Design a protein around this ligand. Structure first.
Ligand SMILES: CC(=O)N(O)CC[C@@H](c1ccc(Cl)c(Cl)c1)P(=O)(O)O
Ligand SMILES: [Mn+2]
Ligand SMILES: [Mn+2]
Lengths: 379, 374
């Protein structure tokens, strides 16, 4: 039958791609809610006109006053929309901190949560896990989507290892000496139109992969010592699972986010024609190589944060956001990003306590941000 | 919860590796029967001593005599062992045509048939399928084991394509002119027939037919890709564009162990891919001009009935002539084609084992006729 879908973050890359999948598949999906920030208010208003969906939310009060007929407006607009809208699936594609409360509200309604928002798991951790019931959260990103599919290859008890693939970034194979010279431009600083400026840099620094490893632990309940990373420059294999008998099951497709988005929306049922398949009529190779963890320690650091638990992964991520922004601003060199994360993390053991509230998560993030600022400035 | 296993073809490669899997896993598996041809009495005698199993079948009467006191001996010994031994799993690793009757006997007992003898399914066709319940036949072949695992990635209605990987053999990339000069040594662990069939691409053709029969997927949705490393063992493409693939360093103990204990995986059966060191998995299209054995397999399979029995039997005779030094390498697949072209009457579905045997008898004769013309 038809799934009723709420799209939170409807004007970003994931949300707009999801709306395309939904427009292509009216027999499978109907939009019953849209939420956005207000920075792209014009897009949201066009979406209302196009879909006919009037059940919309705008977070920015200032933006909302340009309109006069938006039912949900102001800081917790998305949350209130989620609380009051009958839906089968909530796609949470909101950015950063504003994803957390709508995640918690989505879980409470009993809807399936198709989760793109990284902060919900990386920062919210045990708050989100204690709120979700088994199978409720379906991951939207390609690696986690790949893992969910490969885990079908056996029972939970038959799993030996999860292996996430990583592109390796623009500096794959670079030495420590090479990294010293890295400029914001080289590391992917471009005013690109849809994605965020952090995404390309987090890829380059291996911090993105670190974040994906944390999310993997929380999504699938696999110990950190059983979550490996391999560099795979083609990004065709999106991740793999090794079972206790020696068998490895991998998911492969040409890079296209409509695949994992369509599957998250329809889970557990695949959406016919979502993406193009691998074509073996032409010759290709799929290459694998180890990550040099001496040059790129961001994943080791993520495992350290994850094992410590509580709010430590919130600290990891907040330290990154601050350090990464300082590098793009010319305040630090490239290797200093992960260097500052390590230094902030090693001072952060007070945050190993489990959060009781969203406010507790916010407090850890505040401390981490300030601590990282002090590291950058020399204070 | 111990599974009682009968091992047919125990002295060959698959047979010996299965005994190793069973020996490493006494809590899951127990050998209750052994069958062999009698050409490797040293191995069989060691197997009796090591397993303690005296419930043994030896095909060759003279060889069984040289051992003495064998409970089952002569051409139908393996079949009789199957009929009379209580078991949960029959591993049929017999080679070529002698596998058919034991396969049919095994299915009739209700036991799981862990099938390494693909000939019995390729030749048996619908006769074998009608004898089996759903899931009774569990493939030992690495490609089919991989497909079975990958099919867990969705529901039957979500399957778009099955993709069989092929090593390419030692003559990958070679021209038709190059193949004229191939010697039996150049086309030489699995067995002289299996090694040759890998080189000629007839093994892949046989595996294409096996796939259709095992999984019920149309021939025009079974694809072959050349993958030199043989680490990816096969893949399934689903309707959304996702492909699920199975990968491991080549080691038959993995698919053997899974076949014996299906659906349950056997801890430590084989080594996993090591992603702490670099590797590359290469893919290339098959050269269907130089190697048309796979397309001929599809043509035989589509024709159906006893036509797949013809394909296999014609191969067995031409292959034997090549190994004897009587014909050249490219003539093997040439003869299969000529024989299939003449095989009009064999599109009829086998009602009994006798129909299959009639088809094979004719195919062997027609193959010899083709050899004589060279
Ligand atoms: C081992 C197996 O399944 N075979 O049938 C042997 C033949 C196949 C083969 C050849 C070599 C290797 Cl290493 C493997 Cl795993 C498989 P081919 O792709 O050449 O037909
Ligand atoms: Mn990703
Ligand atoms: Mn095979």
């Amino acid at each position: 039958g038809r799934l009723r879908v709420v799209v939170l973050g409807s004007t970003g890359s994931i949300g707009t791609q999801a709306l395309q999948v939904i427009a292509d598949n009216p027999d499978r999906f109907e939009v019953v809610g849209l939420a956005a920030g207000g920075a792209h208010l014009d897009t949201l208003l066009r979406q209302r006109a196009q879909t006919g969906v009037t059940n919309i939310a705008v977070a920015d009060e200032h933006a909302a006053q340009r309109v006069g007929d938006i039912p949900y407006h102001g800081s917790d607009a998305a949350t209130r929309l989620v609380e009051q809208t009958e839906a089968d699936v909530v796609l949470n594609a909101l950015v950063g901190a504003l994803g957390l409360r709508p995640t918690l509200a989505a879980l409470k309604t009993g809807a399936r949560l198709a989760l793109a928002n990284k902060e919900s798991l990386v920062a919210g951790g045990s708050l989100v896990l204690r709120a979700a019931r088994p199978g409720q959260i379906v991951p939207v990103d390609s690696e986690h989507s790949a893992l969910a599919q490969c885990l079908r290859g056996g029972t939970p008890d038959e799993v030996a290892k999860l292996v996430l693939t990583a592109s390796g970034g623009p500096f794959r194979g670079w030495s420590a000496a090479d990294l010293e010279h890295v400029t914001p431009e080289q590391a992917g600083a471009h005013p690109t139109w849809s994605m965020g400026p952090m995404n390309t840099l987090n890829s380059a620094s291996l911090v993105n992969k670190g974040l994906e490893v944390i999310e993997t632990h929380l999504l699938f309940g696999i110990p950190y010592d059983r979550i490996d990373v391999v560099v795979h420059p083609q990004s065709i294999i999106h991740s793999m699972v090794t079972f206790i008998d020696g068998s490895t099951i991998a998911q492969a497709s040409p890079p296209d986010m409509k695949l994992p988005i369509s599957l998250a929306l329809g889970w557990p049922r695949r959406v016919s024609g979502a993406a193009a398949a691998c074509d073996f009529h032409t010759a290709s190779s799929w290459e694998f190589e180890p990550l040099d963890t001496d040059v790129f320690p961001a994943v080791e650091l993520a495992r350290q944060a994850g094992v410590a638990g509580g709010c430590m992964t919130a600290v990891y991520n907040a330290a990154n956001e601050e350090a990464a922004a300082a590098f793009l601003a010319g305040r630090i060199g490239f290797p200093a990003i992960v260097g500052i994360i390590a230094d902030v993390l090693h001072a952060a053991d007070q945050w190993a306590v489990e959060p009781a509230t969203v406010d507790d998560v916010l407090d850890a993030q505040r401390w981490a941000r300030e601590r990282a600022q002090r590291a950058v400035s020399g204070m």
